[PDB]
Amino acid sequence: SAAPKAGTATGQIVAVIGAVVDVQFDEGLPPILNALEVQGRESRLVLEVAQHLGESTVRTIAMDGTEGLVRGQKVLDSGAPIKIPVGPETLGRIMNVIGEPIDERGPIKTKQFAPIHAEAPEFIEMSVEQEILVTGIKVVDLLAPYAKGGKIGLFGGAGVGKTVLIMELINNVAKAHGGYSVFAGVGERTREGNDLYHEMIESGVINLKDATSKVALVYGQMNEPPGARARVALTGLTVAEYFRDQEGQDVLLFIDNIFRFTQAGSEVSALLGRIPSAVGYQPTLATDMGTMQERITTTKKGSITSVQAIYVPADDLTDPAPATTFAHLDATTVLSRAIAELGIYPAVDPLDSTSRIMDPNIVGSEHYDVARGVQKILQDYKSLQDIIAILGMDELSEERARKIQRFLSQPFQVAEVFTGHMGKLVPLKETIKGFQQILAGDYDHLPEQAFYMVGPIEEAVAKADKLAEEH
Amino acid sequence: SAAPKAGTATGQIVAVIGAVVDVQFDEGLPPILNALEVQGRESRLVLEVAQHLGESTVRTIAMDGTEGLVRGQKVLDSGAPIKIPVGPETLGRIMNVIGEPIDERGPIKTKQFAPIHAEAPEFIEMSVEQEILVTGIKVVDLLAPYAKGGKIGLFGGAGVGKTVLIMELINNVAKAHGGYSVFAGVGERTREGNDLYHEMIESGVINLKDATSKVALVYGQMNEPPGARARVALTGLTVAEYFRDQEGQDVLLFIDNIFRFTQAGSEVSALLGRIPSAVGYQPTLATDMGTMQERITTTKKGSITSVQAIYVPADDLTDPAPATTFAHLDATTVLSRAIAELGIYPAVDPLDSTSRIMDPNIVGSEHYDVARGVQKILQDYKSLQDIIAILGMDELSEERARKIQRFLSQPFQVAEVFTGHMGKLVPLKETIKGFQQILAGDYDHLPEQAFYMVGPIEEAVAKADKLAEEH
Amino acid sequence: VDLEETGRVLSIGDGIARVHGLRNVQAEEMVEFSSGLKGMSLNLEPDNVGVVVFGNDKLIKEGDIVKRTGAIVDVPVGDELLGRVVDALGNAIDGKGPVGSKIRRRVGLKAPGIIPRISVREPMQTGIKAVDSLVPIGRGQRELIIGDRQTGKTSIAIDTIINQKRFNDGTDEKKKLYCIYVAIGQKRSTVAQLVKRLTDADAMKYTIVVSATASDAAPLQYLAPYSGCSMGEYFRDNGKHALIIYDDLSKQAVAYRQMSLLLRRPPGREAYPGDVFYLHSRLLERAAKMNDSFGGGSLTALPVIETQAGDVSAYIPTNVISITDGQIFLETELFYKGIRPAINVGLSVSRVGSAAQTRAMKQVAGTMKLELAQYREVAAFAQFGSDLDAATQQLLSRGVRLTELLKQGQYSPMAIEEQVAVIYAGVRGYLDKLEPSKITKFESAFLSHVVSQHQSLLGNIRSDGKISEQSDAKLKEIVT
Ligand SMILES: Nc1ncnc2c1ncn2[C@@H]1O[C@H](COP(=O)(O)OP(=O)(O)OP(=O)(O)O)[C@@H](O)[C@H]1O
Ligand SMILES: Nc1ncnc2c1ncn2[C@@H]1O[C@H](COP(=O)(O)OP(=O)(O)O)[C@@H](O)[C@H]1O
Ligand SMILES: Nc1ncnc2c1ncn2[C@@H]1O[C@H](COP(=O)(O)OP(=O)(O)O)[C@@H](O)[C@H]1O
Ligand code: VO4
Ligand SMILES: [Mg+2]
Ligand SMILES: [Mg+2]
Ligand SMILES: [Mg+2]
């Protein structure tokens, strides 16, 4: 409802230090998580309350710049958290971390708005039903399978193929998707958000005319404070929520880096009056990543098939950032930097790319076996490649892999801007015959890299011609 | 004597935070190290005073749980440190960190009790006499010799053979020992303490009937607070002390991990008002390990041949824990984790197992030479095993070791619960002829692992038959 | 009105209520806020108490009155709770209604001791061949199952628990086992995955499951294990036995430091509050063996741990392996290789010794695990032999073929007498020579072949309880 007590819901700013504004109310202390309105402004400045310091003083986290703020400025108490307008009337538009319209097309007329802080779905709300969903990608679809409501997680070590992949999943999946879609861009480039906008126009997805728009774009990025990157992920989630629940539909949600939800704390923690931790971080990262990701799920009212992305600071999976996250993603894909040298793209690795949907019941007995067999050969392969033989192969022991490694290196669509290679895909269709051959030995002999930047076995001989070797 | 001033030796608890209870007395401040009695209890809660904070307030370290304690509870001043009953009347019984009986056999009737904090023996009390003492073990007895009053130190990296060994030293040494024995179990499992109890019954050592008991068991372990693991080592030492001094006898003392005496501080330091150090630790670990270990020694009144154990946190000898300790132990034995793979047991390593009793005068000119020669061959062996030849042996340069490595891998008694292998031992007896041969070349040729899980050269040919190779 | 028995919040934030008043609060007695919420008093100080709040802050705020619940943090327990799922404070969540219990139990109990305990005997069947046979788990002990992401820790424990089936409705009461599954951190969907799945095998009918799933504020993910410990302690103190699984103590480690740092308790190693030991010593030390003279009851605990790329010696793991007796290491490094469970020998033990493994395994398994203790060298050499000890190949032929018998894997457990069936056949090298590959069909068919005609041979382990001179021959005839 948003209505304070019969006593002043106005406080006066008593302290400003970058992203932290301390405020002091006399007749009506505003709860933690409440959205506050800074008066005397030339724009909209909301400070999210964070602590109740005592001496009748709160502690807020700035949602935008704290420039020019002055020790005494009036701050208003809305009486409810940051609430953004939720509804179909937000589709095709671009919102920011507060619900303000940033695609410039004027007011977002909506029936209601929902708080960005909502109780996560309870135990007796969850759903065990794991119905499959195909992407037609090598490692990504086959190896570590995906699923309805299942969370995807792309672990990239900074420029290894995390965001390229997502645009791609948009390609095969988003467009052809029935039901609505969302894209919360948290942290990452504004450049991309722009293009992504116009590309979504070029391909109708976002149509500025009719009302045939299916995606909703929530943004809050890099040129902004951490209080903002802290919650843009929430907002673009509060969106997808409303669609699944109050409008019973199976939504999709695209978070471009969801751990920016944590760079955030890593930028506000200590400056909040907290004692550091792992790497400096925060004694909250666990509950943080937790409380948030436990919303982007399915339920007895609807499903949210989501796709996230998680960055690898200093290339260290040993960071409690990519790490802690793992326990949430219903399929792993740790793209390796030592893999991009090899060109292998996507850089998904034949080890750290798990799934809680890879059993013979849903993926295949045939499929999940050669998968075991592909990583098997691959494991002793990782050793042999250096161990025993010492780099140079040949040696002895003829007792395929280099082949399969080229198989799952599908260069696909979103990578056209590099070498004309296009949409290498197709939904399982002819994986059969093909990949199995490699492993048992069949058809396996074609002069090494002669089968490199392509996938289907049919192009072993449809290239042997391209590069021939005989007389 | 334990009697306070003509002014209240009662303070009232003013602060509780886990293991640290701050107390405030008005008419009689209790010195540091004094044992305090918490009133209002349903048991016995003693808080050892640690600092004199001022404002007439002390600072204690809890000897057991601080559960239910209340801000105002009366705390009594005993007027003397934690004192445990010392005497022959403690033999065959089990005490805890305060002297309370925990083997359940009722009151420990004794003539007196000694404070657990006593001035270490002075310079003009020490004794240079280093009379040898045989264990009949490979590396342990031969390589890094032991001695009367000498300290033994077993450095294990968490489950590598530190405690197994000690039960063993009990086997050959404790039983056959004339004079009394002690066993302070600090930190480690309660499971073991139990078995160790009943095993000491099965084998009479502890007899519940007559009065033919020689060992004394002091315990304070894992399920307890650090104030307790901090001092159980002290108590089980205050015991061995009384026997050596006031009862002139050469005692033995078995500490199952003596650096738990430091996990302790590592759990109470910072929470005491101190600034951290190496790994976080404490600016006292040196004096700590010091002040304590400088009691377990010999003197002009009696000797204490002790056996300790020191844990290797995170497998890092680089920890100032196993490290700092070294300077105290009269023989080293750093069991390696990369050695247990190799099965080599004990995992004592051919490098880091020193001794300040390994000179030709006491060990042997013949013995200490081939020891130099065993580790010699071993050093360039450690290199060759990888360096030059690159793993695979054979190569060139025929210019024994693998043999000797199997020699000192005596599987002995305490390791029966694994593969029936039994008490491989015998006091030097036939080391002669045997080990020397290996090194000079003699008798050295038997098909490698054909002489693995055994020691005596006599079993090279008494096994060649077991596994034969010819035609 | 009196700060004697109540108090107004001075501050709050990040779930550390610096409450005023509460002069009479005990040091740990959980308390009550105005928004009707629990929190227990952890830092009793001169001018404040610093309570740790169970659940999100929002409603907690400067002035909220706090009340006393003069009772150290205690949780519900009894038989009623059997067959249900609750949070980690007692209250149910599986929507199955209430379980109004009438026998509470505190969580700050001190482990028994030397005298109450006796000796780990009367093993407990995981049903996992590779496990039991190789690594036998005895009852009343703590077996650590470390292992990286995606490696099987929850399945194995889930099989180990599914194995008590036939027991929880048959004869020998003492030959039973109740189960307490603790979920710490996990997505509350992964938990519903198990509750439903365990319900499929009816397994939930004799199990208690508790959840501290992500949303839940750090204290809950903390207090949870100490809540499950108490669950089973009901049995370990009433003759009855139990199996508790602390799924991810590691994640509880991630979740403990949080709470302490916010009370301003100086951090030490990787923020870990120093008493990161007393964190996991205190707990495990509570699953013990009970002597007749005390009850005969038991509680076995398998603490789950997260292996960081393969390191088993990290702070917390050391902290945990340095306690527990017996640690089953699960390596992601292997798995896909087919080598599942994927147990590394040389860095994993049973510790308690052969006492767990009954005479049966003491007959067959006696060679299995240490044949592979040094074989980790030869199986790490053979790949390049040629001219050595010609016939050293036997100790080698014996790792491969067997390995394919050593790879249990399925949502189904093969009872002790079936486990005495297939593996034995190998230890006693008869299948041997034959190139592996099809071995998988032996272990599969040998049973459909056994429960179809050989219904007496298994019966000689429920009579003699070991391998017969007789059935040695009998088996030796169907194998040959
Ligand atoms: N015997 C088996 N053989 C091959 N795969 C199995 C077997 N049993 C279970 N699985 C599959 O193996 C994985 C088992 O481990 P699981 O992921 O449940 O636990 P974990 O890796 O220890 O911890 P986490 O749930 O966090 O990943 C599951 O993904 C499951 O579908
Ligand atoms: N599918 C692909 N094929 C070939 N190269 C790729 C592919 N995806 C990414 N790359 C290479 O890696 C760089 C970083 O990838 P990107 O997907 O933009 O990761 P992120 O945006 O998550 O950092 C690109 O500039 C390109 O050179
Ligand atoms: N003498 C020995 N022979 C063979 N294995 C041993 C021996 N001593 C210990 N081990 C192995 O190492 C493990 C850990 O050893 P343990 O002595 O209990 O060390 P600690 O108790 O000091 O951690 C045992 O479970 C066993 O597998
Ligand atoms: O197993 V020990 O952690 O006590 O080295
Ligand atoms: Mg990016
Ligand atoms: Mg030990
Ligand atoms: Mg799990």
Tab-separated table of C-alpha atoms and ligand atoms in Angstrom, chain B residues 159 162-164 188-189 191-192 256-257 260, chain C residues 322 351, ligand 6:
chain	number	residue	atom	x	y	z
B	159	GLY	CA	45.825	-39.345	8.731
B	162	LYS	CA	50.894	-40.444	13.655
B	163	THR	CA	48.594	-42.044	16.295
B	164	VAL	CA	48.862	-45.629	14.983
B	188	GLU	CA	41.872	-36.216	18.988
B	189	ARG	CA	38.958	-38.776	18.885
B	191	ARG	CA	36.665	-43.343	20.011
B	192	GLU	CA	40.380	-44.057	20.398
B	256	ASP	CA	48.217	-37.659	21.249
B	257	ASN	CA	48.911	-34.405	19.411
B	260	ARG	CA	46.364	-28.985	20.056
C	322	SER	CA	41.292	-34.792	11.221
C	351	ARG	CA	40.042	-46.465	9.878
D	6	MG	MG	45.334	-38.924	15.286
